[PDB]
Amino acid sequence: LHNTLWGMVCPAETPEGHAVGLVKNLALMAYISVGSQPSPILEFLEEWSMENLEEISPAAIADATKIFVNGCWVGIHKDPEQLMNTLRKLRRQMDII
Amino acid sequence: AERGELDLTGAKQNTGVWLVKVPKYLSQQWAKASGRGEVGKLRIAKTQGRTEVSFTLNEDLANEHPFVLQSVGGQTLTVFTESSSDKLSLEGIVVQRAECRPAASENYMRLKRLQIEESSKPVRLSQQLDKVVTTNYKPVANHQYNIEYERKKKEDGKRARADKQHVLDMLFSAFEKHQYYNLKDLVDITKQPVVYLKEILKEIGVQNVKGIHKNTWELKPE
Amino acid sequence: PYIKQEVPIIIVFRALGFVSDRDILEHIIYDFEDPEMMEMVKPSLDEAFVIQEQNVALNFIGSRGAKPGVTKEKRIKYAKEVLQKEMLPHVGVSDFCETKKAYFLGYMVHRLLLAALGRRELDDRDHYGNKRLDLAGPLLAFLF
Amino acid sequence: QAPPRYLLKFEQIYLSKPTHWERDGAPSPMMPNEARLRNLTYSAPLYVDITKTVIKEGEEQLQTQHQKTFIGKIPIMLRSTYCLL
Amino acid sequence: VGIRFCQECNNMLYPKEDKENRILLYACRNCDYQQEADNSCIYVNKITHEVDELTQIIADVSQDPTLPRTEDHPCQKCGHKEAVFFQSHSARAEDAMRLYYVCTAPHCGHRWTE
Amino acid sequence: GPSSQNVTEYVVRVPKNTTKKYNIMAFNAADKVNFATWNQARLERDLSNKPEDQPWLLRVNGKSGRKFKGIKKGGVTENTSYYIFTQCPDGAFEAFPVHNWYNFTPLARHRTLTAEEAEEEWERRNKVLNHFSIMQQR
RNA sequence: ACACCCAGCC
Ligand SMILES: [Zn+2]
Ligand SMILES: [Zn+2]
């Protein structure tokens, strides 16, 4: 029972025997995302103060923070907290995110 | 002087140009102007220890964009030109980079929503039918392709059997045209019944076995 | 993928179209003043000395593919195709998505070096954030 | 390619309600209880729109369209948006 | 210590010595470029704990909500009376449960151990 | 002085149709090239294909000068745009859209190891010695 | 047959 199962998987409901631990059950409020297109996120990020991979010298990557979207390195950003706050605001306001 | 030579007068003059990144709405507005000549103005102010840059949109075009400057020494940015006469020239080198951002913060998100809505117009998702479809597999006396093929077959008709000399004349033209041949193509060229072609070809021709594709006939009498 | 034995990483980087080692280490290494990672990547360059240009690197990649064959251009094309359509398809599939693949491979090697130096913890197969759940939707899509 | 060149494009997907075809060939709505009792499969027909074009050396292109071509049945999860319930 | 490349083919320089002058030459093993070294170092290895984590922590770690905060260790430079303390969790030591403190003031972030 | 509080404001112009195309160009920071030495140039499409969808191949000063090869930018200008403000005697900026982003890379001219002889010497997996002698035989 | 699940008791 890994620590990250808190709130996502029931810590009690497993079969006993040859399948113990391998078969699990969702927590009572667990929700599994059906996915979404990452396009609007990419358009917003490009419109924001983010610089793409091909438009940058490799020397600037070290100080800046990397941006991954769906596991794909898209570009870099120099102000991380501002971007994070803006993105969280957009997600909480049911905007394009 | 050559076709592939690159002219470097611009570099020798050390001409400095500005690279500006702008959003889609400004570019679309500028394009909609149909090249009238003017689309806006740019205001650069210099204080005792700071520099402010902005772009003022034309009031006519609509019916304040602050600018942020970035580092230049990271990469050497230049620009070249290619013309219809295949003459290459270098206009100059980029001396400063500019970033254009909208002054609006909350209301501009409405324009972003409209842009997203426009971008989602052509994307397609499956629809739902209230009633089962019955217009397909409709009964028909015969298929269109079948009747077309029978009409073609009855307009052209069967390939008529001819006298030995004239088919031999086609054979002569044939192995004058090309040394080796395939039985199907010979039938198509000669336009003769396959059994009659085999009968008139076996007398003079022989089949040579090949280890590459298939055994084939030889038009040479010897 | 689709190669039956290991390849040194610098050969793959060279095949992606970066000959000079300055370009290689400007992707794997982001901070110049960090001697430990440079020392740790010295063997990778030392092994790839014999390979010196893009096309010979492509030949290196292609000679160990599905079929040895006879001629050169065919497996140069094979190596180009397998590095264009089968190596990291999620970052690029188009014809000219080479710089992005180079940066991603550099990031992978950077993560490997960071783990080797101990600057990161090795990931866990169970951190349940590293696991995705294929529901009826994705599974039926896979069949369909 | 055989000279003519034939091109087929699949554009739009349609998917009707679950239905059942009796021996008579009469389609009727498959209610899930009926599927459970009669050992049927609770599936909905899948229809697709196809465009067929022909390229000829004489420039006589046709743009014929087969609308809502039946291409099989998809099983339908009960109480989903595409169920009768 | 110290890595730099030749200016001709931009490949890794390698050490070498000459008998005529007896001087270290960082020459490119690929091309035909040579240059005079200025450090007389080839391979420096560090076996014991010389990691110097004090210069390795990113100063932006202070603004992480999941880290503790304390007021008993004020910043040395800016004098702010709040700091964020955390351990290392790096290999090659597997010991030394010591605390590294980072100031939480903006436009600051002096790292200090104690 | 006047330069301390210099005031500048020029009119921007956007032509619709232009007979000559533009493209963004950017060398790497470490290339350290010079433009005075570029007396002659030859920018032709590569022969490796056997037209518009192929890379170029820069050849400077024939065989005497350096040669360069490069690729188009992977990204597309669907949302982004690049405009260049060309200096003119009348002073009005002329923003010009571009068509492609190009990045050539330096290449060194010297005797290069061939794939076949590379395979031949691959037997010396790590037993190889005297790195100069590898190229001396060839 | 066979295969695959599930389940019971240790
Ligand atoms: Zn060199
Ligand atoms: Zn402080």
The string of DSSP letters for B87-139 reads -EEEEEEEEEEEEE--S-SSTHHHHHHHHHHHHTSS----EEESS---SSS--
Nearest of D39, D42, D38 to residue D30 by alpha carbon:
D42
Report how far Cα A15 is from the mean position of its chain's Cα atoms: 32
* CA/C1' separation B125–G2 (Å): 43
Q: Count of alpha carbons within 13 Å of F129, Cβ hemisphere only?
A: 1
Residues of chain A contacting C103 with CB distance shorter than 8 Å = 53, 73
E63 neighbourhood in chain A, CB within 8 Å: 81
Please choose, from the candidates F101, F81, F113, the residue with its C-alpha nearest in 3D space to the C-alpha of residue F24: F101
Cα–Cα distance between B151 and B157 in angstroms, integer?
10
The whole-angstrom distance between C25's CA and the closest CA on chain A is 10
What is the three-class DSSP state of E60?
Answer: helix
Hey, are the CB atoms on C72 and F115 less than 8 Å from each other? yes
Could you give the CA distance from residue F75 to residue A56 in angstroms, rounded to a whole number? 13
Mutate to test the interface with F, among B13, B18, B99 (most CBs of F within 10 A): B18
Cross-strand bridge partners of residue D27: D21
Q: Identify whether the C-beta of residue F83 lies closer than 8 Å to the C-beta of residue F48.
A: no
Domain boundaries, chain F: 1-138
Q: What is the 3-state secondary structure (H, E, C) of chain F?
A: CCCCCCCECCCEECCCCCCCEEEEEEECCCCCCCCCCCCCEEEEECCCCCCCCCCEEEEECCCCCCEEEEEECCCCCCCCCEEEECCCCCCCEEEEECCEEEEEEEECCCCCCCHHHHHHHCCCCCCCCCHHHHHHHC
Strand G: which nucleotides have any atom within 7 A of a protein Cβ? 6-10
How do beta strands E111-113 and F12-13 pair?
unpaired
Contact at 8 Å (CB) between C18 and C105? no
C-alpha to C-alpha distance for A77 and A83, rounded to whole angstroms: 8
Report whether D16 contacts D44 (CB < 8 A).
yes
> CA–C1' span, C135 to G9, in Å?
33
Give the resolution in Å.
2.9
At residue E18's C-alpha, the angle toward residues E12 and E23, to 5°, is: 85
Closest chain B residue to F103, measured at CA: B77
> Contact, A33 vs C137, CB < 8 A?
no
The first and second tokens of residue B25, run together, are 């709405």
Print burial letters for D50-76: b (CB count within 10 Å at least 16), e (below 16).
bbeeeeeeeeeeeeeeeebbeeebbeb
Element of type H or E holding D20: strand D19-21
**A16 CA → G4 C1’, Å:** 20
> Experimental technique used?
cryo-EM
* Residues of chain B numbered 10-69 and touching chain F (CB < 8 Å): 11-12, 15-24, 27, 30-31, 33-35, 37-44, 46, 48
SS3 B222: coil
Residue A54 in contact with partner chain C when CB distance is under 8 A: yes
**Half-sphere exposure of residue B4: CA atoms within 13 angstroms, side-chain side:** 14
DSSP string, A10-42: -SS---SSTTTTTS--B-TT--------SHHHH
Q: Which phi and psi angles does E70 have, rounded to 5°?
A: -140, 155
- Angstrom distance (rounded) from CA A47 to CA B22: 9
> What is the C-alpha separation between D65 and B46, in angstroms, rounded?
65
Residue B52 CA to residue F8 CA, distance in Å, equals 12
Quick one: A60 exposed, middle or buried, by C-beta within 10 A (0-12, 13-18, 19+)? middle
Domain that holds residue E32: 1-45
Q: Does B123 touch chain D (CB under 8 A)?
A: no
Phi (first) and psi of residue F29, to 5 degrees? -65, -25
**Chain A residue with the nearest C-alpha to that of F74:** A54
3-state secondary structure of B163: coil
Q: Report DSSP letters for B17-85, one per residue.
A: EEEEE--HHHHHHHHHTTS-S--EEEEEEE-SS-EEEEEEEPHHHH--EEEEE--STTSEEEEEEE-TT
What is the torsional sign of CA B99, B105, B108, B110?
A: positive
Q: What is the DSSP letter of E12?
A: B
**Residues sharing a CB contact under 8 Å with residue C108, sequence separation 6 or more, in sequence order:** none
| Integer CA distances (angstroms), D83 to A93, B125, B128, B165, E86, in order | 32, 17, 11, 75, 55
CA D4 – CA D60 distance, rounded (Å): 10
CA–CA gap between residue F83 and residue B119 (Å, rounded): 24
Residues contributing to the annotated binding site of E for Zn(2+): 6, 9, 28, 31, 75, 78, 103, 108
Considering only CA atoms, name the residue closest to the C1' of nucleotide G9: A17
Write the residues followed by a gap in chain D (C–N more than 2.5 A).
2
Q: Return the axis-axis angle of helices C73-85 and C54-62, rounded to nearest 10°.
A: 90
Query: What is the distance in angstroms between the Cα of F130 and the nearest Cα belonging to chain E?
Result: 11
CA distance B80 to B70: 22
Q: Which of D26, D82, D17 is nearest to D45 (CA)?
A: D17
Chain F interface test: which of E10, E14, E16 (most F C-beta within 10 Å): E10
The answer to whether B109 contacts chain A (CB < 8 Å) is yes
Dist. CA C114 → ligand 1 center (Å): 28
Distance C95 CA to ligand 2 centre (A): 50
Q: Which helix (H) or strand (E) holds D73?
A: strand D62-75
Q: What are the angstrom distances between the C-alpha of B149 and each of B192, B193, F102?
A: 20, 20, 55
- Say if strands B16-21 and B88-100 run parallel, antiparallel, or are unpaired: parallel
Residues C45, C13: contact at Cβ < 8 Å?
Answer: no
Does C35 contact E12 at a Cβ distance shorter than 8 Å?
no
Neighbours of chain C (3+ CB pairs under 8 A): A, E, F
Q: CB contact, 8 Å: A57 with chain B?
A: yes
Q: CA–CA separation, C45 vs C52, rounded Å?
A: 11
Beta bridge partners of B69: B98
Same domain flag for E57 and E106: yes
Residues pairing with E86 in the sheet: E100
Structure tokens given for C109? 């090697």
Residues E30 and E50 in one domain: no
Residues of chain E in contact with residue A80, where contact means CB-CB under 8 angstroms, are 60
Query: B95 to each of B14, B15, B91, C77, how far by Cα in Å?
Result: 10, 9, 13, 41
F111, closest residue in chain C (CA to CA): C52
Angle at B49 between CA B45 and CA B55, to 5 degrees: 25
- Of D21, D37, D41, residue with least CA distance to D29: D21
- Assess contact for F87 and B95: CB atoms under 8 A: no
Instruction: Compare CB distances from E29 to F30, F108, F131 and report the shortest one's residue.
Output: F131
Strand partners, F101: F24
Please report, as a single letter, which amino acid is at residue E35. Answer: Q
Query: Which residue, B36, C94, D69, A88, is CA-closest to F14?
Result: B36
Which of B2, B3, B6 is the mutation pick for testing F, counting most F CBs within 10 A?
A: B6
Give the closest residue to A40 by CA, choosing from E45, B45, C89, B116. B116
The fold of B156-218 is Arc Repressor Mutant, subunit A (1.10.10)
Rounded to the nearest angstrom, the distance between the alpha carbon of E56 and the centre of ligand 2 is: 17
Residues A54, F74: C-beta atoms closer than 8 Å: yes
**Residues B200, B194: Cα–Cα separation, whole Å:** 10
Task: Give CA–CA dist D12/D49, Å, rounded.
Answer: 5
Min Cα separation B56/chain F (Å): 11
C73: exposed, middle or buried (C-beta count within 10 Å: 0-12, 13-18, 19+)? exposed
Q: Which of D40, D38, D37, D62 has the alpha carbon at shortest distance from D51? A: D62
Residue numbering of the annotated binding site of B: 211, 213
- Same domain as E50, residue E96: yes
The residues, ordered by sequence, that sit 6+ positions from C22 with a Cβ below 8 Å of its Cβ are E5, E10, E11, F30
E65 and E80 assigned to the same domain: yes
Of A46, A54, A57, which has the smallest distance from its Cβ to F79's Cβ?
Answer: A46
- Are A43 and F75 in contact (CB < 8 Å)? no
Distance between CA E56 and CA E51 in Å, rounded? 8
Q: Does residue E100 sit in the same domain as residue E73?
A: yes
- Do E6 and E25 reside in the same domain of the chain? yes
Provide the domain count of chain E.
2
What's the CA-to-centroid distance between E111 and ligand 2, angstroms? 9
Phi/psi region, residue F53 (left: phi>0; alpha: psi -120 to 50; beta: rest), is: alpha
What ligand has the least distance to the C-alpha of E12?
1
Contact C99 A53 (CB under 8 A): yes
Statement to judge: residues E23 and E66 lie in one domain: no
Pick A58's closest partner by Cβ from C26, C100, C129: C26
CATH number at residue E87: 2.20.25.10
- Angstrom distance (rounded) from CA C34 to CA C62: 35
**φ, ψ dihedrals at A36, nearest 5°:** -160, 165
Q: Facing residues of D13 across strands?
A: D48
